[PDB]
Paper text:
As a proof of concept that Affitins may inhibit different glycosidases specifically, we used these libraries (L3 and L4) and those we had previously designed without an extended loop (L1 and L2) to select Affitins specific for the inverting endo-glycosidase CelD from Clostridium thermocellum (EC 3.2.1.4).
With the aim of comparing potentially different modes of binding, we also included [name], which was selected against [name] from the L1 library, and does not display obvious sequence similarity with anti-CelD Affitins. The structure of [name] in complex with [name] showed an unusual mechanism of inhibition. This binding interface is larger than Affitins with the extended loop. There were seven residues from [name] involved in H-bonds, including the non-randomized Val23 and Gly38. Residues Lys39 and Asp44 formed two salt-bridges, which sealed the catalytic site by anchoring at the β5-strand ends of [name]. [name] showed an enthalpy-driven reaction with a higher favorable binding enthalpy and unfavorable binding entropy, consistent with Affitins that bind through mutagenesis on the same surface.
Numbering used by the authors:
A (entry chain C): 2 to 63
B (entry chain B): 1 to 101, 103 to 129
The structure:
Amino acid sequence: VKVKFFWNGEEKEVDTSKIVWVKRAGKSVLFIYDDNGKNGYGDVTEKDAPKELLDMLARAER
Amino acid sequence: KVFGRCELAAAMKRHGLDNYRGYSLGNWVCAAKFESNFNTQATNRNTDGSTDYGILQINSRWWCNDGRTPGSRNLCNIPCSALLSSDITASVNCAKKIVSDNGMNAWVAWRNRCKGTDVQAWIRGCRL
């Protein structure tokens, strides 16, 4: 599944299979992904988040 | 300050990183090696406009304020310059927040160079 989000004004898409770290911040979900062997960053609102990403956050939150 | 390997190990142990969130001391040492080469003053711009700071290369988007990163959350409530000190306290405390919501997967150097390896090798020979 893709996570569609804007980052530096510009439209990004990241596969959830590349996400390695997830955190809730208010009404947003922060995530780090493997970007061809470097860290990439993003965020999306919890209401816009694909359920696959919400699943990752739920697993992290125990 | 450029720490020696065992010098850093001892400092990280005193700061409570050994087994912090289940990560044994060598994980932290190994991550510092590959993030910063043990140099507290290391800084590196990310292509997205953020910058990474200090011995653990902590990023300015979420953790610290550098004054020039859009959308800064400053979750560690510190200037990024605090992460460059010879005293590792600010970096350790910020690292603990990063891992307390998860793990060391936040660090590219840890994923790429440390995970799955004999990380206790990084603390062998050290007086701890």
